[PDB]
Design a protein around this ligand. Structure first.
Ligand SMILES: CC(=O)O[C@H]1C(=O)[C@@]2(C)[C@H]([C@H](OC(=O)c3ccccc3)[C@]3(O)C[C@H](OC(=O)[C@H](O)[C@@H](NC(=O)c4ccccc4)c4ccccc4)C(C)=C1C3(C)C)[C@]1(OC(C)=O)CO[C@@H]1C[C@@H]2O
Ligand SMILES: CC(=O)O[C@H]1C(=O)[C@@]2(C)[C@H]([C@H](OC(=O)c3ccccc3)[C@]3(O)C[C@H](OC(=O)[C@H](O)[C@@H](NC(=O)c4ccccc4)c4ccccc4)C(C)=C1C3(C)C)[C@]1(OC(C)=O)CO[C@@H]1C[C@@H]2O
Ligand SMILES: Nc1nc2c(ncn2[C@@H]2O[C@H](COP(=O)(O)OP(=O)(O)OP(=O)(O)O)[C@@H](O)[C@H]2O)c(=O)[nH]1
Ligand SMILES: Nc1nc2c(ncn2[C@@H]2O[C@H](COP(=O)(O)OP(=O)(O)OP(=O)(O)O)[C@@H](O)[C@H]2O)c(=O)[nH]1
Ligand SMILES: Nc1nc2c(ncn2[C@@H]2O[C@H](COP(=O)(O)OP(=O)(O)O)[C@@H](O)[C@H]2O)c(=O)[nH]1
Ligand SMILES: Nc1nc2c(ncn2[C@@H]2O[C@H](COP(=O)(O)OP(=O)(O)O)[C@@H](O)[C@H]2O)c(=O)[nH]1
Ligand SMILES: [Mg+2]
Ligand SMILES: [Mg+2]
Lengths: 430, 426, 430, 426
């Protein structure tokens, strides 16, 4: 009961997955061979076979072999079922249309057959946890092919989606704006709560809080997994105020399309800093309202908040939480909408945050993940549609998308649908 | 799994190719006998990208070797790695191309291409999933320029959706060994602009400038030039042979690199490069790897990128390094040099990062630049062609092979059309 | 494969042949009895029989017995096949018409039968190397009878031709101008690249460079063979840039009739001088552009160059060659045509020049043969047609030519056709 | 192989001939018996040019000996080399020519020529390839002048394409032994100008001048004069008997030497020549060999070449020598003496070079000069003829043999026509 099917797509989604499953195995005490030495706390994330082997409720999908062949060879080769690590032959080439129309069109009915064989083991499936890059060809095009199928096949089930989204300055591709804009139909129509994350924001959090001068991606993926462990903690553990995955959405989402919250986590801190400050509930609650800790490069003070889910975990008590959010309501720099006088959903879970033993991040008695619907996020969209406009005015790479079976008009129809989302997040702030 | 078929044409193409097979055999840990002797499982994991597996665990490179003379086959077969190649994949004539493009394309190689193409089929049918063709040749002389572009045309017609990826050594005014290179090159660029998906434009004048003003070689040979070319040939395929933090297939390069279909003529480069007497004083770190990689002195075509703007650059890094540090440096470069990148593309740099640096390096970068300055290479070839053609000089050697003055007029027309398209975006 | 049939005609061609075959035997390590003590490097010039005897791919033709009976008796009597040393009974008397119409008319079908029996042993025949005097009766008249037959019998095959041509002052005959002018149809219509050489120029080269005050012909023929060994070296040996015998012509010959290059060789030097200078690639490259080293008495500075083939051999490296010809392009005294911006074909061969052990010429690590198409050579024609005009205005020896079956009008028709060649070499210089 | 048939007529022709056979037998190393006794293979390689090979390795000279008297046959047959000749080749009458050209041509020799000519056939049919006829005679007296020119006419009609080459001792005013030499010579020059291909004009006045002012002989005999003639006879055929750097057949001489058909009257010479008391002080080198060879004192006709211009000169050198040095000296001569050569021929000197110098010399040159000054020999003969003929003196001796005054008028007419053709080009 309370199962989640976790679907990891492209290189970004698979490598965040290889950090998520590194965490969940430590947090439930499962060995990297899937065995458990010595309560059903693992049941959300792992199916148990009669040998005493816990097999993860996850699908890994990539259109090329390289990243999943590394999962099939590294320390987790014995964790996963061998046919739910799914590879094609041909890379999607950072082209949405290869992911959606031409290459991913061959693998999709093998992917959905594995998701069906997972869902048929779930006794009370709670939702999908979908992990991807907005800038990738597999990330945008295959996730958008998959979600369209899952939204007719599992129409009632909540689809939570964790997206690495293009930055203000940092970028890895020229066509990252095209793939991201083409994805905006997926998140609007075939998703229920979409967590945008930014590489440049997490790099700055790493520089300021973790004292690490030059991080890899493995440093980011240990922060993106710490957030999903904190979202799902109420599904897995005992708490004072456990939050259901639909209870979460009923407080986060004010209007059907207004489901793009920010997320942040506290305390992100180096183990050397964590001795010299006390890290009380009020300190870590106030840390979530700093621009310095937002994992998208936009300023929350240029918006209004609509709703917050303060998802506390570890040694946290409801007194201290009420006393903390009363100070957040006292501060005039943190502005809410006139129509949400309640503001805060609170969850409080008794399980401390798990340290990954190779990690940059301290042992702490308390953490909070704050997931936060705010008008400010529209600036991250108003950044990227201005990158799209400069290139599409020249038609600057469009022949590679048209050459792989896409209609040219889908670029106009995607920039149009993004302007209607960027309108809605401005329209509710009044 | 993403097999490449490699093809070598003429003296230059077989020489940069026969050095390339020594470089990627060192990487993959393959002995000159074809047996594996490497350290690591990662060397073996993608050995299929370039080699057929054979009996006794011998690995045979998927090279086709093409020439109109036996003497370069004899020089390769007797060479440092010559025994590694399949005896059936040496396809050759007896009488050479005479440095004549029309002998290559219409007579001497038109006879031989039926015997080449049916070997390219045996290799491509042995592939599990072919990604593309990797052709090494020169645009001066007759074999590489005229037979190699005949062969590009035949493989393009037969495999229309696979990547056609060519490494093309091409003429320059101050380092020329032949009278009719402007003619041979102009007739050859007319085939590359239509058929290839990528063409990596390389110059002996720029390869000597790296040897003299960076490596400080006192007497650089063609063997030293072939070593600079083959380092970048090994560079661009790295992400389909080794694991990485950002993987980029040759197609993931092309989609980012080629804004408009015909603007696929690239200027390659490599880092680190040092004299052997100064490797002791450098720090190989990504900022220093970057400051060399974008230096007008480091690039393997004589076009100074300060005479144009980049459309796209791709920096394919190799080694254990930070993604923040790589993303920081590729930002700092195009903001501090913003006058040298086109402002209608909002990020001009593609990055890729492989976990496995070249044997004996801690880090490497292979640079690919698509720049409006490449027009200066096609402009100077066209200006040399024009002087010879305005007086029909040497044209009885081409028209005696059944060619027309109309084909010369149409080739130089298409050359100025390629120049005009790069100049348009400058 | 890569065979050459070498045809030596009259006294000059046979005696240059007796120096060429002296050289080729040393250079390939063949004894004067045709045996080889201890690679197919010899194959261009020698057929090999099962006894281990290497028999030269050559025909020697003379209309009188004296010079070939000396070849049949001297140290090379055992080298040649006895029926490819071909003699008539009757001298051609320095009369073109005896060579062409009356005496050589009897021997021609025996000469062509030997050339057929050589060509039928060639697996990939590259060309003909034809050696003769322009001033001789056999030299002009028999070569012109032979070439007319070879140009219908072997029409595709390249016919390279090495001609001893009359000098400004030095002459051995009164009728040398008549025989030379009558030959100009042969070189224009039935030859592909014609190397004019001059006895008076080589005598001056001998005086200045070799320190020999009074040379014989054996001193000249060891320089004319050193040039053909350098032309053919790329056919026989490994090199950095081997030049094919048609690759050579595609760079030398800008227009079908414009195939009369100069030739020169460097370093021509005495063994006593060669210790006191270093003879670098740049020194020997610059030596080829001195009027002092041209083997026809004309000044290259009174012309424009069209194309050069710098055929380097021995210890030469492509760096040094590029650096050398960049200085030749820097010098304004060396003037090229506006329509050849490339100028230089380069060949580089790994085999050092062979010293003949009785020779005047030094051991050197490097040589170059420069073969060079230039407008200047038209002065060597404008010298000799002024010698023809003085005699033909009087009809001064014409009764000996008319008496042996020639049409009188062939003298007018040959002086006419020479003025059309001398027009073409002036016409392309603009 | 290029056989010569040699013919001797009258006392002088048999005396210069019987000395010539002693000279060429010394060269070819043949004993007075007819047996070979020489040093060298080169002596035996071309023995066929002048001899028939016969049983016991005896070599019989291809000479026909003709006279109208027995007494010169008796003097030759008994002489130093007399036993070498074939007994059948001595063809002779009994009653002499009386110093009468008409006895030679019409009576005494007209009887005998049927017995001569049928021996010239046996020798010419025994040849492998005959190149020509080499006839020795005198133009004074009756046998050589009148029978020898009858025999030239008969051999010319029978062998029209072979070289007819004559050595012709001929009259002069200050050294004459006969009253009617002007008549005999004028009747004989009329046959030489039409029939011969070359005629070498020799004079006893010039042969005595060489003996007195060069050789310093106190009492020169006819045996000493015959030795000077026969050195130049051996000289001009050298290149068909021995190897050389430049070979010249008698026909290769004629084609270069004879500009207009009838201008074939040559003035021979020889070098070195010295007194036996001064050979110790000379250097024989080509410049000194040249300065003597072109000296007006060295030539064997009384005509000073400073009274005309050369049409052609041929210098047939013998010995080991430089071609630069020979070509230098034959240039320097005709540029420093340019007023003595015709300026409508741009090079007046033919050269030839044989590898084998005469026995006991290190070098030799035989000189042949075709000069407009030869007119002075035909002019003086015609001026002597004219004085005798204007009064019909001695003509009953010729008209008694059936001759006409019309034949005298026609001969002196043709003499002045030959003089006028040499004077025309002066
Ligand atoms: C101790 C040390 O640092 O040694 C270096 C070295 O001194 C330098 C100068 C090397 C050296 O390079 C050269 O000598 C050279 C000469 C002419 C043209 C090109 C190179 C080196 O030989 C080259 C060699 O590189 C390799 O072995 C790579 O794996 C390379 N493959 C080959 O060079 C190779 C050679 C022979 C046979 C097979 C392979 C490679 C490059 C790209 C992609 C794959 C493989 C290296 C690191 C070094 C030495 C040995 C001195 C350099 O080359 C590379 C590619 O790193 C030239 O400048 C760099 C900087 C290095 O510091
Ligand atoms: C030591 C030395 O130098 O002896 C010479 C000599 O002293 C000189 C004076 C010789 C001598 O000549 C005479 O005495 C002579 C007398 C009258 C007329 C002509 C010659 C010599 O007798 C002549 C003789 O020549 C030959 O033997 C040639 O081969 C010659 N044949 C003959 O003379 C001969 C004599 C007898 C029987 C057979 C042949 C020859 C010439 C041309 C072509 C072929 C062969 C030579 C060199 C010399 C002596 C012996 C002193 C000279 O003759 C020649 C042709 O070289 C006369 O001036 C030259 C210069 C020589 O120096
Ligand atoms: N944090 C993090 N970001 C990543 C990681 N891998 C890739 N990214 C980001 O993903 C974006 C590019 O997406 P790709 O990695 O090319 O996505 P993909 O689905 O594999 O694309 P295709 O190769 O075309 O199929 C860039 O903006 C990267 O910064 C990772 O492991 N962690
Ligand atoms: N370098 C050189 N030049 C030579 C040689 N032999 C002859 N010559 C030149 O050849 C030219 C004359 O040609 P001939 O030797 O008479 O030619 P040929 O073909 O034998 O003439 P014929 O006897 O008429 O058949 C002259 O200008 C000579 O200088 C030789 O061995 N070497
Ligand atoms: N880098 C490199 N350049 C070469 C090599 N050999 C020749 N070249 C140069 O590039 C040109 C190649 O022409 P080539 O390959 O000889 O003509 P082809 O054989 O007819 O195709 C030559 O003119 C040389 O300048 C080599 O080994 N390496
Ligand atoms: N050189 C030379 N001249 C001779 C000889 N005998 C005679 N002569 C001269 O030349 C002339 C020749 O005439 P000759 O031969 O006697 O007349 P033929 O016998 O009737 O022909 C004579 O008058 C002599 O002056 C000789 O042995 N040698
Ligand atoms: Mg991907
Ligand atoms: Mg000849």
């Amino acid at each position: 009961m309370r199962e989640c099917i976790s679907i990891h797509v492209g290189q970004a989604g698979v490598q965040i997955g290889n950090a998520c499953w590194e965490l969940y195995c430590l947090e439930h005490g499962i060995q990297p061979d899937g065995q458990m030495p010595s309560d059903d706390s693992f049941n959300t994330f792992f199916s148990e076979t009669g040998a005493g082997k816990h097999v993860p409720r996850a699908v890994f999908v990539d259109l090329e072999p390289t990243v999943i062949d590394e999962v099939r060879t590294g320390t987790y080769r014995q964790l996963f079922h061998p046919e739910q690590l799914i590879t094609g032959k041909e890379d999607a080439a950072n082209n949405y249309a290869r992911g959606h129309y031409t290459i991913g069109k061959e693998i999709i009915d093998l992917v959905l057959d594995r998701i069906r064989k997972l869902a048929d083991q779930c006794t009370g499936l709670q939702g999908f946890l979908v992990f991807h890059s907005f800038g990738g060809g597999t990330g945008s095009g295959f996730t958008s092919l998959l979600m369209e199928r899952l939204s007719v096949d599992y129409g009632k089930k909540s689809k939570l989606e964790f997206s690495i989204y293009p930055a203000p300055q940092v970028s890895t591709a020229v066509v990252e704006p095209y793939n991201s804009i083409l994805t905006t139909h997926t998140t609007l129509e075939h998703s229920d709560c979409a967590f945008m994350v930014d590489n440049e924001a997490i790099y700055d959090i790493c520089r300021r809080n973790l004292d690490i001068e030059r991080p890899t991606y493995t440093n980011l993926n240990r922060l993106i997994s710490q957030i999903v462990s904190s979202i799902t903690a109420s599904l897995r553990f005992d708490g004072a105020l456990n939050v259901d995955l639909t209870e979460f959405q009923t407080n986060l989402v004010p209007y059907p399309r207004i489901h793009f919250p920010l997320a942040t986590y506290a305390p992100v801190i180096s183990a050397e800093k964590a001795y010299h400050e006390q890290l009380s509930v009020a300190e870590i609650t106030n840390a979530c309202f700093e621009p310095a800790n937002q994992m998208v490069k936009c300023d929350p003070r240029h918006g209004k908040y609509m709703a917050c889910c303060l998802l506390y975990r570890g040694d946290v008590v409801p007194k201290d939480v009420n006393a903390a959010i009363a100070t957040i309501k006292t501060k005039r720099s943190i502005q809410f909408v006139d129509w949400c006088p309640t503001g805060f959903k609170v969850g409080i879970n008794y399980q401390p945050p798990t340290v990954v033993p190779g990690g940059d991040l301290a042992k702490v008695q308390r953490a909070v993940c704050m997931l936060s619907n705010t008008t400010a996020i529209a600036e991250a969209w108003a950044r990227l549609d201005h990158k799209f406009d400069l290139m599409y005015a020249k038609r600057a790479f469009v022949h590679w998308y048209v050459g792989e079976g896409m209609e040219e008009g889908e670029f106009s129809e995607a920039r149009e649908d993004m302007a209607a989302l960027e309108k809605d997040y401005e329209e509710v702030g009044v | 799994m993403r097999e490449i078929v490699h093809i070598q044409a003429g003296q230059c193409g077989n020489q940069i190719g026969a050095k390339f097979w020594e470089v990627i055999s060192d990487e993959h840990g393959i002995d000159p006998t074809g047996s594996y002797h490497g350290d690591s499982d990662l060397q073996l994991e993608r050995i299929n990208v370039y080699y057929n597996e054979a009996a006794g665990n011998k690995y045979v490179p998927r090279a086709i070797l093409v020439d109109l003379e036996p003497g370069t086959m004899d020089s390769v077969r007797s060479g440092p790695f010559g025994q590694i190649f399949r005896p059936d994949n040496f396809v050759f004539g007896q009488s050479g191309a005479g440095n004549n493009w029309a002998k290559g394309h219409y007579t001497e190689g038109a006879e031989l291409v039926d015997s080449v193409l049916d070997v390219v089929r045996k290799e491509s049918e042995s592939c599990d999933c072919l990604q593309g063709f990797q052709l090494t040749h020169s645009l001066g002389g007759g074999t590489g320029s005229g037979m190699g572009t005949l062969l590009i045309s035949k493989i393009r017609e037969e495999y229309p959706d696979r990547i056609m990826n060519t490494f093309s050594v091409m003429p320059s005014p101050k380092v020329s060994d032949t009278v009719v290179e402007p003619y041979n090159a102009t007739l050859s660029v007319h085939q590359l602009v239509e058929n290839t998906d990528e063409t990596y434009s390389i110059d002996n004048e720029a390869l000597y400038d790296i040897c003299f003003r960076t490596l400080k070689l006192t007497t650089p040979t063609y063997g030293d030039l072939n070593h600079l070319v083959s380092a970048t040939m090994s560079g661009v395929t790295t992400c389909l042979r080794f694991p990485g933090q950002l993987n980029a297939d040759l197609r993931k390069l092309a989609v980012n690199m080629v804004p408009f279909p015909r603007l696929h003529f690239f200027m390659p480069g490599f880092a680190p490069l040092t004299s052997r007497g100064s490797q002791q004083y450098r720090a190989l770190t990504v900022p220093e790897l970057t400051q060399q990689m974008f230096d007008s002195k480091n690039m393997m075509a004589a076009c100074d990128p300060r005479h144009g703007r980049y459309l796209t650059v791709a920096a394919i890094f190799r080694g254990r390094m930070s993604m923040k540090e790589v993303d920081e440096q590729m930002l700092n470069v195009q903001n501090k040099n913003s006058s040298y990148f086109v402002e209608w593309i909002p990020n001009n740099v593609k990055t890729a990062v492989c976990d496995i640096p070249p044997r004996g390096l801690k880090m490497s970068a292979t640079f690919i630049g698509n720049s409006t300055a490449i027009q200066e290479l096609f402009k100077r070839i066209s200006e040399q062609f024009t002087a010879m053609f305005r007086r029909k000089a040497f044209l009885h050697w081409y028209t005696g092979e059944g060619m027309d003055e109309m084909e010369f007029t149409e080739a130089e027309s298409n050359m100025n059309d390629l120049v005009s398209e790069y100049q348009q975006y400058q």
